[PDB]
Amino acid sequence: MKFAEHLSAHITPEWRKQYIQYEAFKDMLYSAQDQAPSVEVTDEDTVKRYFAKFEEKFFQTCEKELAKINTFYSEKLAEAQRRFATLQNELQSSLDAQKVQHRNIKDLKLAFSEFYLSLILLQNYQNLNFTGFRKILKKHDKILETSRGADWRVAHVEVAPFYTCKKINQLISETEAVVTNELEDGDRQKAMKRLRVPPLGAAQPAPAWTTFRVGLFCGIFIVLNITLVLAAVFKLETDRSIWPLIRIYRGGFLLIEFLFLLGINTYGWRQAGVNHVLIFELNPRSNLSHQHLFEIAGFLGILWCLSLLACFFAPISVIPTYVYPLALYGFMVFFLINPTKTFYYKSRFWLLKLLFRVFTAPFHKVGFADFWLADQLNSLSVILMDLEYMICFYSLELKWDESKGLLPNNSEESGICHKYTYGVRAIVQCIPAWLRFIQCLRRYRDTKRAFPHLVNAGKYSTTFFMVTFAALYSTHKERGHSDTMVFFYLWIVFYIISSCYTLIWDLKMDWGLFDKNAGENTFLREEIVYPQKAYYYCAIIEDVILRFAWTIQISITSTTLLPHSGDIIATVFAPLEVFRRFVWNFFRLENEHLNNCGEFRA
């Protein structure tokens, strides 16, 4: 409870195998103590021999661990020295050539800032390794009631190069001096702010106010949800088409669920050790933990619930009901594009910059963050459809001259908005598929490698064909023309091939599972990061079920049952799709952390 969790939390995720392995030492010590022959029943020679053998084994494995630590530290120090030499030569050449430039200076600053992080991590590694060598030896001395542990510590631990080397501190001082004198023209305070690192990993507690705000937004959200359910059961005039209301408000709920599940994903990545900071190319000093995502999700969900309640209750009769969704979505879009440096300025503007590069894909280099956001869009494709439906409902169908808005009279109300219109919903349902397809094409063009990339481009071509044939079949269905059966069967077969193509790809390369090097972990990867093995199997089963999702509905649709059956299926499968994306992110990030899965770093 003191040093086991301290080591498990302050460890560097990429260097886990290079630490002291405190837990194994503790378990071995406890097992050896518990397996003593007898206090008095057996001879004193027997127990002395047992203790001597255990002492020899403990010192042998301790020597092995110390040698491993020494070799790792020496290799890391050599790498740091080489990197410092190359970076200093680059700076010397650039400064002489100086006599655009701002971009070069900023890149040099970033390179210096990242090099300082490596030195800090190495220093932390040294400090953590000595602390564990003093604790485990102390525990050995106490458990066996001996003093040879302290003698071994004095003899070996404070002789190895991993403890007597001071070049890391000298390197840090030289780096700080170089940054202060060459990059900032004095002003050590500004240089130190850029270079200094906070406690990283799971070692940083979230501020109390952020957790309090998360709790406050969660409780208000729960109470508002209960009130919304009660109002739906009791209020509402029954004979009004509520379908536009929850079709418009479906996108907000999907966004709220996505943000909550993304916060859970961030928490899981932080705890399991799979670092999303390096994969997403974020600065390790300042990051968004799960608490910030939870707070954002809670605030936006509170706004969504308030707008829905205002729609149900209509507190003020001078304002028509349809203003509330407009106000809610205007606030949602104004929060994102807030020009002031308030309310998560850096995160929101990084997101906006990424959205600019994800919506103009072929003209930008494809990193992980922009690839990661066009894969997340595929699951939030109902949000775009909801936005288009809201725009077409307000601009074409809504009767602005009459007080009641989104809830009109039930009889014969059908308008283009709820149909494949003239094909608008089809292209708005592939837009994310188009973005991913063109991103894959750009990656293939830039790299030249067409396996990871010519493949994974037809995965979204299957979505293209799926949506196109669904649109054709539906359009032939409403007008009553013939040849619908052929289009129905083409829709069926293309959904089959699309689900099989992205299901095999999901488990083979995106997740890394089903590899010939499974070993003990049957049907799993050679090395797993998440603690329990049951998570992977349940995730595989759920992904199989949740990806083949059209099956459950078609049956419902085939029965139809006489209600608006399709709308009940897509308002009960969209959250399932978001949950599937949330569970897919975990293993995508884990595979990328373990074995560069998409080749986004070299």
355 occurs within a structural domain: yes
Eight-state DSSP code of residue 268: H
Indicate if 264 and 317 belong to the same structural domain.
yes
Residue 579: count other Cβ atoms within 10 Å of its Cβ.
16
**Alpha carbon distance 140, 150 (integer Å):** 9
| Separation CA 18–CA 73 (nearest Å) | 9
Which residue, 197, 218, 249, sits at the end of a domain? 197
Cβ neighbours of residue 497 closer than 8 Å, sequence gap 6 or more:
462
The answer to whether residue 249 is domain-embedded is yes
Q: Rounded to 5 degrees, what angle do the CA atoms 204, 582, 359 make?
A: 95
* Residues closing a segment before a gap in the chain (C–N exceeding 2.5 Å): 99
Residue 135 lies in domain: 4-197
Say yes or no: 89 and 41 in one domain. yes
- Asked whether the beta carbons of 379 and 577 are under 8 A apart, the reply is yes
Beta bridge partners of 240: 409
Instruction: Answer with the one of 197, 218, 246 that is the final residue of a domain.
Output: 197
Check the annotation: does 213 bind a ligand: no
The CA distances from residue 87 to 80, 376, 482, in Å, are 10, 37, 71
Q: Are residues 527 and 561 both part of a single domain?
A: yes
Tokens of 468: 């196109």
Q: How far lies 493's CA from each of 462, 587, 596, in Å? A: 11, 29, 33
Residue 516 assigned to a binding site: no
Query: How far is the C-alpha of 586 from the C-alpha of 506, rounded, in Å?
Result: 12
Tokens of 167: 């070049």
Q: d(Cα 107, Cα 85) in Å, to the nearest integer?
A: 17
Domain for residue 573, yes or no? yes
Show Cβ contacts of residue 408 under 8 Å, excluding neighbours closer than 6 positions: 240, 241, 244, 399
Same domain, 62 and 162: yes
Compute the Cα dihedral for 203, 208, 209, 211 and give only its sign: positive
Q: What are the phi and psi torsion angles at 404 (to 5°)?
A: -70, 135
Domain-embedded: residue 600: no
Q: Which amino acid is at 551?
A: T
Is 547 annotated to bind a ligand? Reply is yes
Q: Are residues 380 and 472 in the same domain?
A: yes
Could you tell me if residue 122 is inside a domain?
yes
Greatest alpha-carbon span in the chain: 102
Whole-number Å distance between alpha carbons of 191 and 180: 6
Does 163 belong to an annotated binding site? no
Angstrom distance (rounded) from CA 434 to CA 258: 21
Query: Tokens 């990545």, residue?
Result: 269
112 & 159 share domain:
yes
> Could you give the number of structural domains in the chain?
2
Phi, psi of 240 (to 5 degrees): -135, 140
The crossing angle, in degrees rounded to 10, of helices 167-178 and 188-195 is 130
What letter represents residue 170's amino acid? Q
Helix ranges (DSSP H) in 235-367? 243-248, 250-272, 276-279, 290-313, 323-336, 345-359
Task: Tell whether 236 and 122 lie within a shared domain.
Answer: no
Residue 190 CA, chain-centre distance (Å), reads 32
Burial class (CB in 10 A: 0-12, 13-18, 19+), 209: exposed
Residues 128 and 252 in one domain: no
Resolution in A: 3.4
Residues in the chain: 602
Q: How far apart are the first and last CA of the chain?
A: 39
Tell whether 134 is covered by a domain: yes
For tokens 């809504």, name the residue: 398
Q: Are residues 421 and 509 in the same domain?
A: yes
Helix-strand-coil split of the chain, %, nearest 5: 75, 0, 25
Helix (H, G, I), strand (E, B) or coil at 204: coil
Q: Are residues 334 and 462 in the same domain?
A: yes
106 class by beta-carbon count within 10 Å (0-12 exposed, 13-18 middle, 19+ buried): exposed
- 259 and 287 share a domain? yes
Experiment type: cryo-EM
- 498 falls within a domain: yes
Task: Judge contact between 427 and 433, C-beta under 8 A.
Answer: no
The residues facing 409 across adjacent strands are 240
CA–CA separation, 387 vs 249, rounded Å? 10
43 has binding-site annotation:
no
Residue 440 lies inside a defined structural domain of this protein: yes
- Token pair 């649109």 is found at 471
Judge if 478 and 542 occupy the same domain: yes
Among the candidates 179, 197, 215, a domain finishes at 197
